[PDB]
Each structure stands twice: as C-alpha cells, then as structure tokens.
C-alpha cells in the first residue's frame, strides 16, 4: 500500500542517518563526504513525494519517530564533525612558523660578510 | 662538526617536513597530529640554535636550499589541511553570523575600485 511505502521511505532515511553517524564514529570521512550528497538528495526526494490518503495518527506517529531518530543522529554527526574541524584547525595555527621560517630563510639569505673559500 | 650539525639539522627538518606533507596527501591526519609536537619541537630547537663562524656561501646556499624546501613543504601541507577544513565546514553548515559575515567579505574583495 501507499502507507507502508510512506513508512518504509522514512525507514530508509532513518537508516542512512545512522549510517553516516558511523562513517564518522569510526573515522571514514573520505567516504562520509561522498554519501552525504546522496543522503541529502534522498531526504529531498522523499519530501516531494505525495503523502498517502489514509494516514492514521498511529502511522503519523511511527514516521515522526523515524524523523526524530534521524534528527537525533543528525545532531550527533554535527557534533563529531565540529570536533574534527576543531582539532584540524588546531594544527594550522600552532605552525605559523612560516614567519619563523621565512625569517630564518630571509636572514640567512641576506648575509654580506659570508666568505666563499 | 659545529658546521656539519648545522647542515644535518636542516636536512633533518626538510626530511621530517616532506614526511608530514606526504602523510597529509594520504590523509593520514591521525599520524600528523602525533608527529606534530615533535616536529614543531625540533624545528624550534633549531632556530634557537646558533649560526657557526665559518659559513661559506656553499654552506649558506645549501642550507637555504633546505630551509626553502621545508618552507614550501609546509606551504603545501597548509593548503591540503585548509581544504579539509573547507569541505568539513561545508557539511556542518554556517551559522547566521558566519553567513552575514562571509557575504560581507566577498562583497568587498569582489569589489572593483576607481577614484
């Protein structure tokens, strides 16, 4: 029926959300980055679908729970992401030795008393 | 030997640096974080270092060659790492401010001047 199809569609997204939560909980960002484009294109498709006629409050609740499940992994993800963004952004900063080095290079580069033999 | 250790150190930095770059190209950032402190540690311990009495333009040129070598290795590393941050943010999404501010910046750079 169109009602199980409705439910199932959202069961499908609920899964993918939980899918990426892992692609990050474990460490696969190279992957996760690829599968997000889809997960998004997926949430999008299921939204321009036509909600069946005979929807009952019971069903409405079932689907909503899935969406909640989804929104909940979506917040865990965002957290882990901001966390990885954090420690990485931490690396660039400490190392503005570019000046220490550009200084260490420029200095040596401009010596005038340097003999040769 | 106080002249040799001088060269040998920068050789070593240039080496460690090539190392770290390569690791990033692979995306092995977990190891970068690890080796980082030790790297910044050494690279600093080297500038704290004193420059010898008998540098010849050869030792000069040579060492410069390394310093400029490690200097570009990092330049490249910074770019990969900045790109990770870039696509990583792309995912998390921008805050309300972040947008109102970024837009301002582009509107400025993407501005043609004429007085």
Curated annotation (Swiss-Prot), chain A:
Family under the similarity heading: Belongs to the FliT family.
Broad class of the protein's primary localization: cytoplasm
Start and end residues of each stretch annotated as FliD binding: 59-97
A Pfam family per the record: FliT
Top-rank lineage group of the source organism: Bacteria
Intracellular or extracellular location(s): Cytoplasm, Cytosol
GO biological process: bacterial-type flagellum organization; negative regulation of bacterial-type flagellum assembly; protein folding
Record keyword Transcription regulation present: yes
Subunit organization: Homodimer. Interacts with FliD and FlhC.
A GO cellular-component term linked to this record: cytosol
Location of the region described as Required for homodimerization in the Swiss-Prot/TrEMBL record: 1-49
The protein's name in its UniProt record: Flagellar protein FliT
Assigned keywords, A-Z: Bacterial flagellum biogenesis, Chaperone, Cytoplasm, Repressor, Transcription, Transcription regulation
Entry keyword annotation includes Transcription regulation: yes
Organism expressing this protein natively: Salmonella typhimurium (strain LT2 / SGSC1412 / ATCC 700720)
One MF term in the entry's GO annotations: identical protein binding
Task performed by this protein: Dual-function protein that regulates the transcription of class 2 flagellar operons and that also acts as an export chaperone for the filament-capping protein FliD. As a transcriptional regulator, acts as an anti-FlhDC factor; it directly binds FlhC, thus inhibiting the binding of the FlhC/FlhD complex to class 2 promoters, resulting in decreased expression of class 2 flagellar operons. As a chaperone, effects FliD transition to the membrane by preventing its premature polymerization, and by directing it to the export apparatus.
Gene encoding the protein: fliT
């Amino acid at each position: 029926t169109s009602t199980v199809e409705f439910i199932n569609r959202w069961q499908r997204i609920a899964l993918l959300s939980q899918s990426l939560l892992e692609l990050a909980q474990r460490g696969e960002w190279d992957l996760l980055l690829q599968q997000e484009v889809s997960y998004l294109q997926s949430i999008e498709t299921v939204m321009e679908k036509q909600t069946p006629p005979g929807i009952t409050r019971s069903i409405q609740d079932m689907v909503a729970g899935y969406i909640k499940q989804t929104l909940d992994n979506e917040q865990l993800l965002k957290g882990l992401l901001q966390q990885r963004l954090d420690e990485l952004s931490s690396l660039i900063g400490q190392s503005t030795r570019q000046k220490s080095l550009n200084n260490a290079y420029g200095r040596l580069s401009g010596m005038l008393l340097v003999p040769d033999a």
